[PDB]
Structure 1
Amino acid sequence: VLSPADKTNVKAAWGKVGAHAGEYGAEALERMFLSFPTTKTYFPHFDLSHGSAQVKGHGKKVADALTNAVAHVDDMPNALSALSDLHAHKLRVDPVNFKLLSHCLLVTLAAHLPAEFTPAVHASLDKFLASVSTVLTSKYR
């Protein structure tokens, strides 16, 4: 459950990400694929090599949804509805993977926002990603 403080933290950190969102997105995916190889089982149709355009492209979509999620932090369920549909009915990614990607996004953020990645913001971001994750797998069964 995001407090006002959390929402404040997130808006702030995502703010500094800004224009770089999509790059971080693709960075995070790469860190994931390398760190947790099992996640590659979901992208057999992808060129998973370094700088693959597919990964760059995918990473942009993922950053865009997150931006959309920060903008509607107070109504993620509705703001992310088509995406929760897609995940629940089409992609059907086992829920443990969300925790793997969330970890790699924090890693990305930490490595790019030294001044901004304080303990309190880290804590907020962790909670935010967990919430997006809950929304995305909310329609599994």
Structure 2
Amino acid sequence: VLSPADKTNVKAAWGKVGAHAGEYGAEALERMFLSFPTTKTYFPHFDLSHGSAQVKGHGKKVADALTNAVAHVDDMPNALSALSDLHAHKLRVDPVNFKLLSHCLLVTLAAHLPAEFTPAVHASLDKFLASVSTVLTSKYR
């Protein structure tokens, strides 16, 4: 349950990401593939080399969904319904991978938004990524 402070915190941090969201999207993916190589099993059709346009484009996609989710922080289940569908009925990614992407996203933000990545903001972003993961995996069975 995102508290009002968390929602504020998230909106701020994400605010600063701005035009770089797609790049942070792509960088998080790249750190995920390297740190947690089992995650590559879901992208056998992608070129996972450094700076692939597949990874780049995929980063954008992801980053965009996060924006939409921040934008509708109060209505995630609803703002992300089509995405929960896709993940639950087509993709069927194992839930543990959501924690690995979430972590690589925190790491990316930390490295790029040093002044905004305070302990309380870190706390909020984590709770937020968790909430997003819950929603995306809520219609699995």
TM-score > 0.5 by shorter chain:
yes
Deviation at 1:17, TM superposition (A): 0.1
Cα offsets for 1:48-75 (capped at 9, x unmatched) = 0000000000000000000000000000
Deviation at 1:137, TM superposition (A): 0.2
Cα offsets for 1:92-125 (capped at 9, x unmatched) = 0000000000000000000000000000000000
Cα-Cα RMSD: 0.2
3-state SS, counterpart of residue 48 of structure 1: coil
Query: 1:43 and 1:131 mapped to 2: Cα distance?
Result: 24
Give the equivalent residue in structure 2 for 1:4. Answer: 4
Cα offsets for 1:31-59 (capped at 9, x unmatched) = 00000000000000000000000000000
**Taking every aligned residue pair, what percent have the same amino acid on both sides?**
100
Unaligned ranges ≥5, structure 1 = none
Does 2:132 correspond to 1:132?
A: yes
Moved over 2 A (4+): none
Query: 1:122 and 1:79 mapped to 2: Cα distance?
Result: 23
Unaligned ranges ≥5, structure 2 = none
3-state SS, counterpart of residue 74 of structure 1: coil
Q: What's the TM-score once normalised by structure 2's chain length?
A: 1.00
Instruction: Describe how 1:28-67 pairs up with structure 2 within 5 A.
Output: 28-67=28-67
Q: What's the TM-score once normalised by structure 1's chain length?
A: 1.00
3-state SS, counterpart of residue 73 of structure 1: coil
Query: 2:71 and 2:78 mapped to 1: Cα distance?
Result: 12
Deviation at 1:78, TM superposition (A): 0.6
Deviation at 1:27, TM superposition (A): 0.1
Query: 2:54 and 2:48 mapped to 1: Cα distance?
Result: 8
